[PDB]
Structure 1
Amino acid sequence: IVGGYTCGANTVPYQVSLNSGYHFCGGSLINSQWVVSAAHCYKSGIQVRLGEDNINVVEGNEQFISASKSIVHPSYNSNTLNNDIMLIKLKSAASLNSRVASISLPTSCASAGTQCLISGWGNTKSSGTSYPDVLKCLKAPILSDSSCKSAYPGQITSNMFCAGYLEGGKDSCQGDSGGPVVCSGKLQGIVSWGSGCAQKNKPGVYTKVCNYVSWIKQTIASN
């Protein structure tokens, strides 16, 4: 997260870190057994780390649970990033309390102008590289479809939305991938892609979670 703020420990209780020897992506806990992330975050041997603030220090609220199975969206295209969503099942159910909690799925899509919270452990610099140990947060609005398409001609599908600031300086970034965009207590987006980070006229692009609720529910019901 570039141009954000330190969230505070366990203030984003649905945020998870996906670990394969190291943090590599975010995700969102949506029930005791399941995490939503980006399909571009797929790999084998994932450990889901819940209850994290400092990802390099054991601070007392962590639950580390291996994934039993990952399900990339059936129509994910890794070239275009269309349908950039994946479900991850935990081998055992997480213990839920106020520091580790699920986030609700949307029942309606969010509109441009809605304010959201984007979070993660990704790079905090728009030029060069600095990875934080503690969770970072950014409040940002959803942008209009027309501004999003104008920013990224030929690239924005009906399964994507832009959020952030056209002036630059405030965005998600590498290592935030897969993490949440939460608006009015609902998971509306997944950190997906963008041109660099925090660049002028190049806002963040997010997977439009409301399009996937049917798939998520039916997949959980049978897996």
Structure 2
Amino acid sequence: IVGGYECKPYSQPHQVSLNSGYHFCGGSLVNENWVVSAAHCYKSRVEVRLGEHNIKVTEGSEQFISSSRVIRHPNYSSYNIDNDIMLIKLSKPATLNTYVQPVALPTSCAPAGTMCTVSGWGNTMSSTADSNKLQCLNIPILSYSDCNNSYPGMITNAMFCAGYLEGGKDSCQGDSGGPVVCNGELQGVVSWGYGCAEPGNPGVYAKVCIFNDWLTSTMASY
């Protein structure tokens, strides 16, 4: 996260770290058994770490749970990073408590201008901000016009832009798969962008609100 502030510890209890030796992507707990992340973060098996604040120090609030199933959206395309969403089933249910709580799936698509929070342990590109401690950032959802203008012909129905066209504040590598929460609901998943915090290059996010059918059906299928 570039240009944000350190999240208050456990203020984003749905935030999870996907670990394969080291943290490599974020994700969001949507219920005791399932985590939503980005398809470009796909790995056959991953260890989901919940209840984290500082990912390099044991705080006593963590739960490390291995994945049971990793399911990429059927239409995910590595050629253009389209339909960048994936579900991870936990091999054992997460224990919900003060440090671990699920985030609600959207009841509808958030309109442009809606203020959201994006968080993660990715590149901060600053000498002050320690990426081992969860970083937070408030970003507004941009209109399709603004999004298409920045990335001509690259924005599909499954993508939306959020951030600032002036740059300076953005999600970055390592934040991939993480949450974009607006009005208490998961509206986006950190997906792609040109660099981080560059003017004219806002972050691109998977549009969760158009995947409710797939999400609901898959979470009921085994």
- 2:39 aligned partner, one-letter code: A
- Tell me the matched-pair count: 221
Per the alignment, residue 156 of structure 1 pairs with 155
Q: Name the SS for the 1:189 alignment partner.
A: strand
Moved over 3 A (4+): none
Query: What is the 5 A alignment of 1:74-223?
Result: 74-125=74-125, 132-223=131-222
Cα distance in 2 for residues equivalent to 1:75 and 1:132:
32
Q: Could you report, residue by residue, the CA deviation over 1:5-33 in whole angstroms, capped at 9, with x for unpaired residues?
A: 00021110000000000000000000000
TM-score, normalised to structure 2's length?
Answer: 0.97
Q: CA deviation at 1:45?
A: 2.6
- Does the 8 Å contact 2:26/2:178 carry over to 1? yes
Cα distance in 1 for residues equivalent to 2:78 and 2:109:
24
- 1:73 aligned partner, one-letter code: H
Residues 1:56 and 2:59 are matched in the alignment? no
List runs of 5+ in structure 1 lacking aligned partners.
none
Q: CA deviation at 1:44?
A: 2.4
Q: CA deviation at 1:187?
A: 0.2
Q: CA deviation at 1:98?
A: 2.6
Q: CA deviation at 1:180?
A: 0.1
Q: Could you report, residue by residue, the CA deviation over 1:182-202 in whole angstroms, capped at 9, with x for unpaired residues?
A: 000000000000000000000
Across the aligned residues of Structure 1 and Structure 2, the Cα RMSD in angstroms comes to 1.2
Cα distance in 1 for residues equivalent to 2:219 and 2:163:
31
Per the alignment, residue 17 of structure 1 pairs with 17
List runs of 5+ in structure 2 lacking aligned partners.
none
Cα distance in 1 for residues equivalent to 2:97 and 2:52:
14
Cα distance in 1 for residues equivalent to 2:194 and 2:221:
37
Q: CA deviation at 1:79?
A: 1.3
Query: What is the 5 A alignment of 1:59-74?
Result: 59-74=59-74
Cα distance in 2 for residues equivalent to 1:159 and 1:190:
11
Q: Name the SS for the 1:150 alignment partner.
A: helix
